[PDB]
Amino acid sequence: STTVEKIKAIEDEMARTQKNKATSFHLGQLKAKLAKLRRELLTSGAGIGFDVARTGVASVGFVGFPSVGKSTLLSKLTGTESEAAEYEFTTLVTVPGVIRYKGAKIQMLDLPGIIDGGRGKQVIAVARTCNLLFIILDVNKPLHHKQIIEKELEGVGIRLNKTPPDILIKKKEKGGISITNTVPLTHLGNDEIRAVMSEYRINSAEIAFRCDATVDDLIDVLEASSRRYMPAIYVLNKIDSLSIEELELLYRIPNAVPISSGQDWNLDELLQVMWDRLNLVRIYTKPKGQIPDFTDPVVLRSDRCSVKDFCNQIHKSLVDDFRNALVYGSSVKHQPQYVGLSHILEDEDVVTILKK
Amino acid sequence: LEKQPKITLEEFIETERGKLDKSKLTPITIANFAQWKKDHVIAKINAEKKLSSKRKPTGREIILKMSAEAWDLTEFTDALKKADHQDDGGIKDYGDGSNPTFDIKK
């Protein structure tokens, strides 16, 4: 398409343009032109729950180049040997399997489709709607592969291990672009900010920087409705080619879990960290008379754990006859407390619902 | 050693790994890894112990203190866990996540 041709033309220009005081405005506009185009590709009911059935409280995506290490990894994590489709590179997404960890069903997807150089947009949507990604590397040759995986993921608006930047943009009527600043800005000039805002055809606005924002950070904020921020774990396979001191050293890299898929080393850690990053919320049900069961929590998602959500998870009707809920736990500022439907629960809260 | 500066995987490959004297390295055998793992896990436990003292107690933890010292939902819950567990045959259960094993089926 012309739109896919337009992207390559900009990537090309950027690569042959040296970066100085004189070129920075244009390059700022180019980055913005590029960002806008890339979002248009996502523009279309997509991803998990649509393009594949959602089969857990969380869905977790694996991204890696084909290898014996990665096949063994998936087989081992899921308990079932790789199926015919998990060996095809023309295939775009597979489900290696569903696991249960601390009571939560977690769907594990493999996403070879993200690496390929209608259905192409389905794999992208799936990737974007995962709760966590594992990036599988061979620690004997990590850089080339890491660089491609990241480019492809960033390219489709996924932001790995990031919180949205603290920039406020208030759109104005008159008087052009006005800029506020907390911590001094080491990466943006006003020229570049204007470059981005004008490319976005924003005549007049008030922008407040509470972070040492980069030009990409600003763009991310402008593109906030389509950016997907997600935890990613760098799985560094093949540590048996290293040494103890080298292994220790990998733990100085954030979000890395070094493993050996052959020996099983650190698979336990891998799963623990996965759980930690997914931030699911187990609620323990307690009837008025008896105690909470602690055996069968209802597991809610990080961004969907209201008392309302708890109720619905148990049965559609409950909301209609809801008086209130009695809650013990970290979500309430006194033990216990009565709360309403909109009350946001926290992992291992204990809950007793009451009838209207 | 304490709080040490963080590194990238790039930094690791390009400069950090090479600072090491290769003739002093400890082989990563089954035995040496087991010893390293033993200490690794012990540190986690010590780190967690310190965090526990500062974290608000969980609803679970609160009931447990209260223990150690009206809506009948049965029908809906029974049904829910039944549904939740019906496909259990094809799903590997890690339980509480302690001491997992990694046997492959089929």
Residue numbers in the entry:
A (entry chain A): 2 to 45, 53 to 125, 131 to 369
B (entry chain C): 214 to 282, 302 to 338
Reproduce passages from the article.
The Developmentally Regulated GTP-binding proteins (DRGs) belong to the OBG family of GTPases (which also contains the Obg/CgtA, YyaF/YchF, Nog1 and Ygr210 sub-branches). In addition to the GTPase domain, these proteins also contain a C-terminal TGS domain of unknown function. The yeast Drg1 homolog is named Ribosome-binding GTPase 1 (Rbg1) as it was found associated to ribosome. It associates with yeast Dfrp1, namely Tma46, which is also a ribosome-associated protein.
The final model of the Rbg1fl–Tma46205–345 complex (R-factor 19.7%, Rfree 22.2%) includes two molecules of the complex in the asymmetric unit although the complex behaves as a heterodimer by size-exclusion chromatography. The Rbg1 structure shows a domain organization that includes the well-conserved G-domain (G1 + G2 + G3 = 64–169; G4 + G5 = 245–293), an N-terminal helix–turn–helix (HTH) domain (1–44) which lies adjacent to another domain formed by a 65-residue long insertion (176–240) between G3 and G4 of the G-domain and the TGS domain at the C-terminus (294–369). We named this new domain of Rbg1 the S5D2L domain as database searches indicate that its topology is related to the ‘Ribosomal protein S5 domain 2-like’ (S5D2L) superfamily despite the absence of significant sequence similarity. The two amphipathic helices, α1 and α2 (2–44), comprises a previously unnoticed HTH domain at the N-terminal of Rbg1. Tma46 fragment present in the structure shows a non-globular type of fold predominantly formed by α helices interconnected by coils. Tma46 helices envelops Rbg1 forming an extended and extensive interface (buried surface area in the interface ∼2978 Å2) contacting the G-domain (helices α1, α2 and ß strand) and the TGS domain (helices α3 and α4) with no contacts with the S5D2L and HTH domains. Our complex structure demonstrates that the region of Tma46 contacting Rbg1 is larger than these earlier estimates and encompasses residues 216–279 and 302–338. Interestingly, the interface between Tma46 α2 and Rbg1 α8/α9 consists mainly of aromatic ring containing residues, which form a π-stacking interaction. Superimposing human OLA1 structure bound to ATP onto the G-domain of the two chains indicated that the P-loop in chain A adopted a closed conformation where entry of GTP could be difficult whereas chain B had an open conformation.
